[PDB]
Amino acid sequence: REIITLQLGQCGNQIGFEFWKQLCAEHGISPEGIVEEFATDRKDVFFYQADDEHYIPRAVLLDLEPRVIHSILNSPYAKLYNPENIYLGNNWASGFSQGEKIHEDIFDIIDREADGSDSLEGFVLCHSIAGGTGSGLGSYLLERLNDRYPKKLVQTYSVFPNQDEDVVVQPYNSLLTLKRLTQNADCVVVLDNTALNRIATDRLHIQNPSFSQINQLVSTIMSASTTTLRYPGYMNNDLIGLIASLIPTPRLHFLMTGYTPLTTDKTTVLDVMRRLLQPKNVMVSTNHCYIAILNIIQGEVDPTQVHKSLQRIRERKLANFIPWGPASIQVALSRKSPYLPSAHRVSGLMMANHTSISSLFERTCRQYDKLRKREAFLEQFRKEDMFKDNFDEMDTSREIVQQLIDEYHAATRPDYISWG
Amino acid sequence: SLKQFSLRVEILPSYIPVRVAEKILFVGESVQMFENQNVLKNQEDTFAAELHRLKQQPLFSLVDFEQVVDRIRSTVAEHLWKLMVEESDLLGQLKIIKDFYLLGRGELFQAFIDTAQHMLKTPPTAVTEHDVNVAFQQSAHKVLLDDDNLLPLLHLTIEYHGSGWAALGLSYKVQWPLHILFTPAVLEKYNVVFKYLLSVRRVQAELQHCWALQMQRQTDAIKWRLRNHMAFLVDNLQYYLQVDVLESQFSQLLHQINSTRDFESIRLAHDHFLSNLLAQSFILLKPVFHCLNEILDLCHSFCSLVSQNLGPLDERGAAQLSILVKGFSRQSSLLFKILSHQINSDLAQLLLRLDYNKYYTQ
């Protein structure tokens, strides 16, 4: 079924903009949406089909106190994203309360693409955790979508903010978002601004323009995570059949990333899997263990060596695990596209359920806990206080995230057969 | 034809071997087969002049008799290759056979299981045959990729009075020049592969429906989830082993087809393809096929139990779910011992699952 992507907030609109531009270049699409004259892919799922070959994606752009959205509009690609669906504070409560009044028209914008498609399976959110306007509104929209579409599934490409810790209410905002995501998010792929920044310092000398260049790293992850859907194959010819192996338990739906040639600007399959399991290629910043690991490779890959490659990785034991979950690593393959550079002819990515993301959840919980004892930024703004007089949704969010942390470490324990 | 014509071994002279008379049989059956249905470079008199000269020789020499028949053997087989592979192209025909008998069309056969799920579930009865054909016809247009004809060479056959999924045979309509290459016996062997491959393809999809139910939603959901995901591992692993053979063996088959211009290699190409295709599926071996099926069948009963309610179910289901998670743990470790000709596909499939050593450590 066709996928509709709900890019929201300033940062999320930035990464959705770059994601659709990269898929414009990777597929046979021009900046005006026209089929390219120089051009074998499954473009049905991600791109709606207009009659005169206007491959307009099913992007829903939401602006709130808009600045970067006008910059999105004055682009050469503004004719490419034309479903005409753009509808006009730094606190979570302000974003939630601003989303509540315009929920019906933005939901009618959802409804129109849902009717216009042949079918719809997933809502993939370019969400920004603690993103000012993006947080709050994203949690409220996340809460509306599962009610209105109970059979349907919601993915979240969360850019989890770690910038070495400006937003002084950032742990409060991220705390509320994560409660909404643990109960009302079907899947979440996690990314880290510090880890992408350390990778930026590693591969290049870029330090001050960190966001603009990390946009490209995030976008490479985002395109390669969907390439096996966008191009046909033997297995994982649908999203839900992919997401099943990555998420064994619904509370631990959080997924780590990594890419073997981080400098993708011949290598055998044994080499690229061994490089992938190393922590430099990982883009995420008591025993600890993976629950399940999956890998996808795109390029000039020899077929008799992929089974033997997973044999050799098993002999290496570079990834360590002893979870409750039985899911073993599998060697999957996707199609490298034409017309774009085929540099680093073999090139790969991993998605995995790993218990070390509970530490990064616990970091913003620790920041929230010290800020909550200090009460230094309760904000006491009349929006914040009139919306939450009790301020107990932060405590419900704290007990839900504390359940999540305990569930992660219980998944590390030998008995997750019992109560987690 | 292709009958009432055979060697009589008891009357065959002893100095004439069996191999040369087999070549005699082949050139006779070939020139009979394309002799009729007509409604030919004339070496008939020159081979007569060869055989007239061979009559004048006093003494029987075998190597001359072998040389002359194998000359006529190769000349008839070099043509009958050229007529078959070029005018009635076999490479397209073998593609259609793999696409539907061996589940090479994934979008259509997954949608046909999805659309016709209840009416193949229901037990067989004389009117179910037309119902599954129009749904297969709907499945052909559900996956809208549709050319012209391509469709009236295939139908579905249910048999009743001698779970309608059990009696689901697929049949193809062959043309005359491919009727010796495709007898009913080989499409009968193709039929058992079709029933096995659609079984494991069915189990994978509705198990992910259990996964999709479990992720949209106490305890006892998160015990099903363990049982769902434990059954999910060996279920995707087993179909992935079937992915490996269907790629590797069909690449071998098309290659020895195009290897030489002999018809005899074309027949031996198709015999080498099926013998490996049956073997890596392990269906001719009894106890592995007799245990992997109930692995899928017990997973059907679990996947029904989770599909019963979104609410938690300890109404006698938690009694046998704990029986199921122990009964599945036993048999999947039993086949893990069996997996542990020494074929590379069978032996390396293990240490996929042994990447965690998960059943071995237990």
Residue numbers in the entry:
A (entry chain Y): 3 to 41, 45 to 93, 101 to 177, 180 to 279, 287 to 306, 313 to 447
B (entry chain K): 253 to 291, 300 to 422, 448 to 502, 509 to 631, 636 to 657
Please quote the paper that reports this structure.
The gamma-tubulin ring complex (γ-TuRC) is the principal microtubule nucleation template in vertebrates. Microtubules are formed de novo in a process termed nucleation, which is spatially and temporally highly controlled by γ-tubulin complexes, composed of γ-tubulin1 and associated γ-tubulin-complex proteins (GCP). In most eukaryotes, microtubules are templated from a preassembled γ-tubulin ring complex (γ-TuRC) that determines the position and direction of microtubule growth. Here, we used cryo-EM to identify and characterize γ-TuRC assembly intermediates after recombinant expression of the complex, which allowed us to delineate a comprehensive stepwise assembly pathway from a stable 6-spoked core to the mature 14-spoked γ-TuRC, identifying successive stabilization and conformational locking of γ-TuSC units as central principles in the assembly process.
Upon recruitment of the terminal γ-TuSC unit to the GCP2(3)-facing side of the assembly intermediate, the conformation of the γ-TuSC(3,4) unit is locked in a manner similar to γ-TuSC(5,6). Different from γ-TuSC(3,4) and γ-TuSC(5,6), the terminal γ-TuSC(1,2) unit is already integrated upon its initial binding in a conformation that matches the structural organization in the fully assembled complex. In this new, ‘locked’ position, the γ-TuSC(13,14) unit can directly bind to the γ-TuSC(1,2) unit by virtue of the MZT1-GCP3(14) module, which stabilizes the γ-TuSC(13,14) unit on the complex and thus may prevent it from dissociating again. This indicates a two-step mechanism for completion of complex assembly and ring closure, involving first, positional locking and, second, stabilization of the γ-TuSC(13,14) unit by γ-TuSC(1,2). In the second step, γ-TuSC(13,14) is stabilized by direct binding to the γ-TuSC(1,2) unit, preventing γ-TuSC(13,14) from dissociating and at the same time physically closing the ring. Formation of the lumenal bridge specifies incorporation of the terminal GCP2-GCP3 unit and thereby leads to closure of the γ-TuRC ring in a left-handed spiral configuration. While the MZT1-GCP modules may play a role during γ-TuRC assembly by providing extended intersubunit interfaces, we could observe these modules not only in assembly intermediates but also in the fully assembled complex, indicating that their association with the outer surface of the γ-TuRC is not merely an effect of an incomplete assembly process.
